[PDB]
RNA sequence: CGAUGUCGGCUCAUCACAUCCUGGGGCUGAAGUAGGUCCCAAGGGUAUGGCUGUUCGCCAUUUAAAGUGGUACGCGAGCUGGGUUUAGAACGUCGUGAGACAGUUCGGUCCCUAUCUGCCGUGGGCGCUGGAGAACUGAGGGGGGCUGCUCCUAGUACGAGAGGACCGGAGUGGACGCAUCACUGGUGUUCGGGUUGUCAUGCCAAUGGCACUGCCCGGUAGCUAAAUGCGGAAGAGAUAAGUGCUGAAAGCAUCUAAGCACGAAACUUGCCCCGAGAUGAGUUCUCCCUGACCCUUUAAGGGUCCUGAAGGAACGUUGAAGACGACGACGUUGAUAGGCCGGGUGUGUAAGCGCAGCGAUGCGUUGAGCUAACCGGUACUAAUGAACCGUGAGGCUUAACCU
RNA sequence: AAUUCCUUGUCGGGUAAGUUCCGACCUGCACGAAUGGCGUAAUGAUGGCCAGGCUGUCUCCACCCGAGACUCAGUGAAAU
RNA sequence: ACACAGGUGGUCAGGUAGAGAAUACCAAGGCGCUUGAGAGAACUCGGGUGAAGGAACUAGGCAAAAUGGUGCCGUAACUUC
RNA sequence: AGGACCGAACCGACUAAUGUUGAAAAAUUAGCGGAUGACUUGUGGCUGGGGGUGAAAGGCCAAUCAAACCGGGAGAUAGCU
């Protein structure tokens, strides 16, 4: 089905009754409220665009405010879009709550991971370090060789070298949802999800079997 | 983190006794052996306490019929059934890891009595 | 480690296409003294946001 | 966290006193032995008329580690010294009849049931 | 990679920073307005303002505690005798930074950091 | 030959298939288990050590397996320099001798700041035909595909017994990859404490400087891994070898010629990520701009005045974002940073004073004092009114409507 | 054997496993008696091997402190 | 060749701790090394610490770690005593 | 007493790393050897090119050594580029 947009609150644990600690991530999922519905007859695909949270009145621009004003909804902190599953139906301005996950049993959580900046190939690609002694001259963490010789005389595409690690979309699949709390607007999933605390998540039902 | 602070304190057990490192402590622990749920006892000197609310641990060191054992316990686990303080102990540090190097008469902790 | 054909003056100016300095772009006018200064900085007479400061 | 080249003590009374691990069995490029994992050992020291003599190559199961085991609540159990019980090489179930020191609840299995019938604690 | 770490390093080691802020805090207490670089001003806040709040409560232990930090006895006279009772109701915000251009010698972004009264 | 560095090790690969494993299958001198041999198959996987300079090899112990080759016997402007193969020295041997021997032995300088291509990242300009803010579809591209063991089916099928399944399902590992910091830990020269030498703050007491952070003991946040979560799939489509069904040419037979069905980790999808410079520059939603007047070599021509929108940029406070740009948050109708307040955490019961003791010291006030990056608050300080860029309804032709 | 090609000779010791090392054998390709033979206590920044301790050498790297590297201002090369 | 991390003979030689002209901190005295300001990436250099293991590294324990003082006890083979 | 032992000055230069268009045409840093002797050092002197000197390496003789440097024979000669 569709998913909901959360916010990574942090991690805790949930002691079970038989004494098994479960590492959970707390995801506050407020009222995701639908701002646009997309049909084949106008867009070629069925999908809903939701917003969540709240934004300052002076910080939302006039394009954006006109969009949310047409939808008849309060401006949120962003717009996201979920593809619909052929028998689902939503209306504009409809609110969607964490209660949707009261049946789902296992979810997939998509966020932007923590940006580690320009990372070298030992951090980035798990290259193995060369000797730390035994003669080695200024080449301890360096990548070694990068290709062959006259044949090809080029470095191939997607050679693993150093550069920006982190700060990109990653999806963690098949996380066990531990609690759905409709009162406090919370979703407790088992495990770590991507992102620092306060980062926006996207929690969908698991597509894997 | 009022969400997490509110959510953890719903799980914290209330009757955890006040102990500090240096104390001899009996900890009764639920041990499950197939169908029977036994409760066994682990008595030793507290050598370390981490206080973090729900994530509070404490390390207890025993010299069990041979060599020495350190159990770290999660204080607010339902496994950890009872904590009782046998002998109150007088030390000066907060983490007593030097006792890992001492046996017998050298690993001997004075009593606190106040 | 060193070039193998001398680069042209074309390629040289292409590399320097980004070395251009940006102008100030407009510097703001004090409330009391009415004189000009960088924004968020104090003026040459030593005012800032219409009140007298330093005074050396 | 026992790997090759690691000198372990001996928990049973098979005759060995100090052994060395020579492989961690159970997979390819497997690095570590652990809680109740089988290793192959060589005997680096023995008592003068034990069942196993110096320089024999046989199996053992690790029963205590300095690194320790983690329980499902997050609690760890570290020992002070790594120790093994020397199993028989072909068909296991170990050599010695006594077992010294404590063991852990993670040898609660079929085979090592013998090891926890002995073994004064846990 | 630095994530949530606080404190500029200022191209010095730890003992030279500690010494440098001890002197520079002494100078800001002494003269009430000094011209420094903009990063050194911004770190001087986090060194200086705790001395003022320590000075808001006069006792022998705070005089000695503000003489371990700062290491000058005139300075812990002006704190505790003048500045501590001067602020006394001001909750934080004992000092303001006023950006004031660039040096000539190395084009560094200077700034005048001053105490927040100077009503004299 | 006005120099193309040559073994081996390391780091890092990459392709072929004449396949080592895993997958499909035919024949078997294939009962089962395990095999032998041949066809198909390149998805992924494909040891650690002793000895030796060694590749190789032998050995030890693993493993599902420890493939065979190409890539200047891949890789020295990436590392090493053990071997070969400079200059010293010695042995055996050859020569009268200088010396010599891919015979042996000991010792013996490995430079380069990257212009171009390539590659990994990351921006600026312009374009996309009025400008701008967002959300998207998706052409296309990349990542990922490994596998053991245990249990059930079932000690059934098979076999005289020993032994012992196919197909199907459940669990739990190894190696690999992604994320993360709740736990267990590491670090934590920015926090607390102990302590040696010496110097200073007049002195006692208390502190501070210097000695690798003086040496240590703990330790917050962050980062982290040995820590903990997750992943590799099911399924679909078209097939390889192979197996067929109906069926003639060839009144039989025949899997093929017409027609039809199965069929594998390969192939196209399914899963994850990038992605409209996809110049074939797409879509959707929203927002803004509704003035006059001259000149001419009358053109999507030039100019003057008045206007300056949506928005952006600059500046500032900055960030679990960051080499710099970039990206994100906030700028007073404001929690963006600092301070402050409360808490937490860490250390471990400060200083002063009192009492006991001849004194070192101990005890009381006292779990005290001090507490970094943490948490919850608070406008006290700094985030200034403005200026700057961006315009004024957006070409031609044709078509369908103007209900 | 600083000497032995065949050769990692053969046996033994050490090792889980030892082309090196120690002891021995002797079929010395091609030792051998002042171009000295064989022993040899002490000595050696000498060559080879083993062991205890010790460790980031390594499994497998992680974090931190500093100096560059990166940005700004000033000066301003070089091989080719 | 330089306002060059090099070379250059003699003389004086305070305190505390120390065997000491070593070493640490200081006095007299002299200096802060003639580019600075930021930031806090990879990578390089100089260092600190490190779970479990402890030479598995490697040509080879190279490098690092470790040991380290004074007094007393005690001390093997072999030996030219 | 000692070509005695440990160890600074002093003389040296075993290992590693840096440096290698260096700070330096041979050094720096951390360890390292000798350190009353066949030692080390200052000032002066003497030995000279097929010659010196050499605890011997073909080492050293002014950053030059299987025959110094300067000047000359000299525009040596070059079937080679």
Curated annotation (Swiss-Prot), chain B:
A Pfam family hit: Ribosomal_L19
Keyword NAD in record: no
Organism listed in the record: Escherichia coli (strain K12)
GO aspect biological process, one term: cytoplasmic translation
Function: This protein is located at the 30S-50S ribosomal subunit interface and may play a role in the structure and function of the aminoacyl-tRNA binding site. In the 70S ribosome it has been modeled to make two contacts with the 16S rRNA of the 30S subunit forming part of bridges B6 and B8. In the 3.5 A resolved structures L14 and L19 interact and together make contact with the 16S rRNA. The protein conformation is quite different between the 50S and 70S structures, which may be necessary for translocation.
GO function term, MF aspect, one: structural constituent of ribosome
InterPro entries assigned: Ribosomal_bL19, Ribosomal_bL19_CS, Ribosomal_bL19_sf, Translation_prot_SH3-like_sf
Keywords: Ribonucleoprotein, Ribosomal protein, RNA-binding, rRNA-binding
Domain of life: Bacteria
Family: Belongs to the bacterial ribosomal protein bL19 family.
Expression induction: Part of the rpsP-rimM-trmD-rplS operon.
Gene name, Swiss-Prot/TrEMBL: rplS
Complexes and interactors: Part of the 50S ribosomal subunit. Contacts L14. Forms two bridges to the 30S subunit in the 70S ribosome, contacting the 16S rRNA. In pre-50S ribosomal subunits interacts with RsfS, which may inhibit association with the 30S subunit.
Protein name: Large ribosomal subunit protein bL19
PROSITE patterns reported in the protein's UniProt record: RIBOSOMAL_L19
GO cellular component: a single term: cytosolic large ribosomal subunit
Curated annotation (Swiss-Prot), chain C:
Any one cellular-component term (Gene Ontology): cytosolic large ribosomal subunit
Keyword Ribosomal protein: yes
Molecular-function GO terms, alphabetical: structural constituent of ribosome
GO terms, biological process: cytoplasmic translation; response to radiation; response to reactive oxygen species; ribosomal large subunit assembly
Segments of this protein annotated with the region Disordered: 1-37
Keywords: Ribonucleoprotein, Ribosomal protein
Pfam families given in the database record: Ribosomal_L32p
Keyword Disulfide bond: no
Family: Belongs to the bacterial ribosomal protein bL32 family.
Subunit structure: Part of the 50S ribosomal subunit. Contacts L17.
NCBIfam families named among the record's database cross-references: rpmF_bact (TIGR01031)
Name the record gives this protein: Large ribosomal subunit protein bL32
Source species: Escherichia coli (strain K12)
From Swiss-Prot, chain D:
Coiled-coil blocks: none
Signal peptide residues on this chain, from the entry's feature table: none
Residue ranges crossing the lipid bilayer per the database entry: none
Keywords: Ribonucleoprotein, Ribosomal protein, RNA-binding, rRNA-binding
BP terms from Gene Ontology: cytoplasmic translation
Covalent S-S links between cysteines: none
GO molecular function terms listed in the Swiss-Prot or TrEMBL record: large ribosomal subunit rRNA binding; structural constituent of ribosome
Role of this protein: Binds to 23S rRNA. Forms part of two intersubunit bridges in the 70S ribosome.
Family, as annotated: Belongs to the universal ribosomal protein uL14 family.
Subunit note: Part of the 50S ribosomal subunit. Forms a cluster with proteins L3 and L19. Forms two bridges to the 30S subunit in the 70S ribosome, contacting the 16S rRNA. In pre-50S ribosomal subunits interacts with RsfS, which may inhibit association with the 30S subunit.
HAMAP family the UniProt entry points to: Ribosomal_uL14
Descriptive protein name: Large ribosomal subunit protein uL14
Organism encoding this protein: Escherichia coli (strain K12)
Gene: rplN
